Design a protein around this ligand. Structure first.
Ligand SMILES: NC(=O)c1ccc[n+]([C@@H]2O[C@H](COP(=O)([O-])OP(=O)(O)OC[C@H]3O[C@@H](n4cnc5c(N)ncnc54)[C@H](O)[C@@H]3O)[C@@H](O)[C@H]2O)c1
Length: 221
């Protein structure tokens, strides 16, 4: 199969590396029992989506729940927690990231259940943003581990080296589980043929700019 791999990554050293080397970093720390059963499966260029419709990888609607507001995310994209050129093996391991979610090179997203999406534990408390992502490549976590996948309901697509801001279309600003705004990313590279952004008439759609006055709402640290 063909795959775009790490094309969406923001970290330059992960961008520049070969697919075999990134695959090595992701799989090397897997137990021998897991390596016997599992293989590292990247999202293919052509895939079967959650409604059994065959789509391009860029047209699969992914989402990321994140506490950080558009003034950072639309500006920087999704930069992973570990960006350094010589990370520890713990920080590059897909299985440990999928299982425990310790600091790593990966950015977590989830597939839109075309039928709804997986919701985190405290999504209905505080200020949370559901970012809409249309990106190439990424690692399919369920296809990689199969029944050994620790949290299969998450439907996780992990991105080693992050996600560029050009692949983020929009963001739903929720205050205590209630939508306030729908942010529109002006720098979104539109691949064409996408559905309109999911919206009721009551929710205002706001075109984002750098340092937007309403664009930095967040929880207290
Ligand atoms: N994020 C999602 O929408 C999503 C998708 C699928 C599965 N999950 C699962 O949910 C659980 C929680 O994971 P998560 O993705 O929310 O954890 P995370 O560590 O990626 O991020 C939690 C919080 O850390 C902060 N943060 C993230 N990246 C940062 C950075 N580079 N610099 C500074 N602060 C940063 C943000 O406030 C974010 O809300 C895990 O089990 C994960 O597998 C989450």
């Amino acid at each position: 199969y063909m795959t775009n791999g790490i094309q969406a990554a923001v970290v330059e050293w992960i961008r520049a590396l070969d697919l075999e080397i990134i695959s090595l970093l992701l799989s090397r720390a897997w137990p021998m029992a897991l390596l016997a059963t599992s293989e590292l499966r990247w999202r293919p260029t052509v895939l079967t989506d959650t409604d059994n419709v065959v789509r391009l990888d860029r047209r699969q609607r992914l989402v990321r729940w994140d506490r950080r507001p558009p003034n950072e995310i639309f500006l920087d994209g999704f930069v992973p927690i570990v960006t350094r050129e010589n990370p520890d093996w713990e920080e590059t391991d897909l299985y440990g990231f999928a299982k425990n979610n310790h600091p790593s090179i990966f950015v977590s997203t989830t597939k839109t259940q075309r039928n709804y999406v997986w919701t985190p534990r405290n999504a209905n408390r505080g200020i949370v943003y559901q970012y809409e992502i249309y990106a190439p490549g990424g690692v399919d976590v369920n296809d990689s581990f199969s029944d050994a996948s620790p949290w299969p309901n998450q439907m996780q697509v992990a991105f080693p080296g992050g996600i560029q801001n050009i692949y983020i279309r929009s963001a739903r600003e929720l205050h205590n589980g209630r939508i306030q705004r729908i942010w529109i990313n002006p720098n979104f590279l539109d691949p064409g043929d996408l559905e309109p952004i999911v919206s009721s008439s009551r929710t205002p759609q706001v075109i984002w700019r750098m340092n937007h006055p309403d664009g930095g709402h967040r929880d207290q640290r």
